[PDB]
Amino acid sequence: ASEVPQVVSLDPTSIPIEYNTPIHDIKVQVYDIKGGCNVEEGLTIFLVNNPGKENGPVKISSKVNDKQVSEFLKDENMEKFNVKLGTSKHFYMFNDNKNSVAVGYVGCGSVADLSEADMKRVVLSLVTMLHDNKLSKLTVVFEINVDKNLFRFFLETLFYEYMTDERFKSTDKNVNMEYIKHLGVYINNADTYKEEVEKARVYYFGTYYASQLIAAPSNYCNPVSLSNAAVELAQKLNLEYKILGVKELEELKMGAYLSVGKGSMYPNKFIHLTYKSKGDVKKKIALVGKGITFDSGGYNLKAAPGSMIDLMKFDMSGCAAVLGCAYCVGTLKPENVEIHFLSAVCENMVSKNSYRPGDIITASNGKTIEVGNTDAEGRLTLADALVYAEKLGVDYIVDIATLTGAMLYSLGTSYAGVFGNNEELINKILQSSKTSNEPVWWLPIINEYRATLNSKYADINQISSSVKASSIVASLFLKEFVQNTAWAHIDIAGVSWNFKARKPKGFGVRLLTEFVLND
């Protein structure tokens, strides 16, 4: 734990973190739908669809253990409503014990298998029913088909979207902020789905924890304060930790990493968390996250129209995702595995002490790098991070980074891109993507472009000057720093930020965790 430097005494010296969220107070009960649905206090929502019939009528199929509610929800009354994806309706009636109840439904389209995006729409429609309504209990009746992974995804998404981050609110807190205390779920073959509930709660927070870190502004979330939070997290989870300061980094000759942070008031802090299983270890994995707490661009300042310099607190999303994974792994405690969580945290700033364009710097593997652009600082920090990671002697090195903005032009805001030197590892990422429902796509490392990184003076150029394929060029650059290890690179620069909702996604936490677990 290191002291955070301040310019004025009003400068924050730590990131506020909410561990005990209202979600953790919610008691979750899972009932088998065969036994019928009890409709009591709170709000009972049925998830219905109508296969084939686009915007077809609503039909409740479950047994409802109440004569009154059954009559209300009979087919001929429900037919005036439809199952259009995103549609919702509220019902009000009295049950058999003469107690008023609130019932409703959410349309789930006319397609049998809902994609992760469709399910997210259903959750969002469901969440609006939770907002501005002081409910004590929510009951969800699944009348659609979901496998165990999609059921978990439903819960995680619900917990995430329902949650509101009011850490930075002061005079403008929602005076009506009131969370439900009970969640009931009716589903076919409930005994098989029950194991997903706690996994969802663990996945939710790991995602929401990374979200809190990302959403934290660059004056709260700096290299020192972020490394402090990693320490606290590790102390709560009994993870081994090591926080490397500038001096050790100099001794390890991390010249590429150090140059990036030269222009910052905050000293570089290299984060090293370690989870090791108690049993015999059969797999060693290093998970690397890019940790630029603020990216001004350096002397290559982000001043072009649309450079979104104000959003650049998000450039440690990779680090956040890695730390969120550290929570999920340290909590669920997988066996036969050893995971290193790495992040070379620093801050790309403009100063008299900054690194300059044209500077030639030496990485910790001896390779000299000519800087052609100070705004491509991520691949520099990752270079030293990758070399460090390989010295640990692992089987897999996976890095996750908000690296290139060109991802928005290639995959957009929904799908992340994965690059690598090992096809087996890449397939495991794609498999992890399926089971976590965090969309990833395999993109090529095109060797024909490697020649454009040939520097006249240094061993290698940082950027190309004749190739607009930035995501591939950067992957080619990073590949030059992994000598003999299966390695994959996930570019989340396009998917890390939910633009419509103006908030982080916490993308990668579940993806990386499903990777650790299913191995």
Q: Would the annotation count 315 as a binding residue? A: yes
Query: What are the start-end ranges of the E strands in 2-136?
Result: 27-32, 43-48, 88-94, 100-107
Out of 15, 469, 493, 516, point to the residue binding ligand WRC (CB under 6 A): 493
Using CB under 6 A as the binding rule, whether residue 376 contacts ligand WRC is answered as yes
Closer residue to ligand WRC (CB): 17 or 309: 309
State the nearest-atom distance from the C-beta of 344 to Zn ion, in Å. 12
Q: Would the annotation count 375 as a binding residue? A: yes
Residue 192 CA from chain centroid, whole number: 26
Q: Cα–Cα distance between 74 and 108 in angstroms, integer? A: 19
The answer to whether residue 199 is catalytic is no
Out of 97, 278, 352, 424, point to the residue binding a copy of itself (CB under 8 A): 352
- Binding residues for a copy of itself, total number by CB under 8 A: 121
Residue showing the smallest CB distance to ligand WRC in the complex: 405
| 249 to 268: interface string for a copy of itself, x by CB under 8 A | -x--x-x--xx--xxxx---
State the nearest-atom distance from the C-beta of 495 to ligand WRC, in Å. 8
Side chain identity at residue 393, one-letter code: G
Composition of the chain by helix, strand, coil, percent to 5? 35, 20, 45
Q: Of the candidates 344, 394, 315, 311, which has an alpha carbon nearest to the alpha carbon of residue 230?
A: 344
The answer to whether residue 121 is catalytic is no
Q: Would the annotation count 172 as a binding residue? A: no
Out of 66, 116, 156, 295, point to the residue binding ligand WRC (CB under 6 A): 295
Q: Which stretch binds a copy of itself (CB under 8 A): 316-324, 377-385, 402-410, 506-514?
A: 402-410
Tokens (6 digits) for 459 = 């061993």
Tokens (6 digits) for 262 = 């030269």
Q: Would the annotation count 93 as a binding residue? A: no
- For every residue of 313-377, DSSP letters joined together read GGTTHHHHHHHHHHHHHHHH--SSEEEEEEEEEEEE--STTS--TT-EEE-TTS-EEE-S-TT--
Q: Would the annotation count 34 as a binding residue? A: no
Interface with a copy of itself in residues 204-233 (CB under 8 A): 215, 217-220
Interface with a copy of itself in residues 265-304 (CB under 8 A): 265, 294, 296, 299-301, 303-304
Q: Identify any residues that bridge with 442 across adjacent strands, giving them in sequence order.
A: 418
Burial of 412-449, coded b for 16+ CB within 10 Å and e otherwise, reads eeebbbbbbbeeebbebbeebbebbbbbbeebebeeeb
Binding partner of residue 497 among ligand WRC, a copy of itself, Zn ion, none, CB cut-off 5 to 8 Å per kind:
ligand WRC
Query: Annotated active-site positions, please?
Result: 302, 379
- The footprint of ligand WRC (CB under 6 A) covers 295, 306, 308, 311, 315, 373, 375-378, 402-406, 408, 463, 470, 493-494, 497
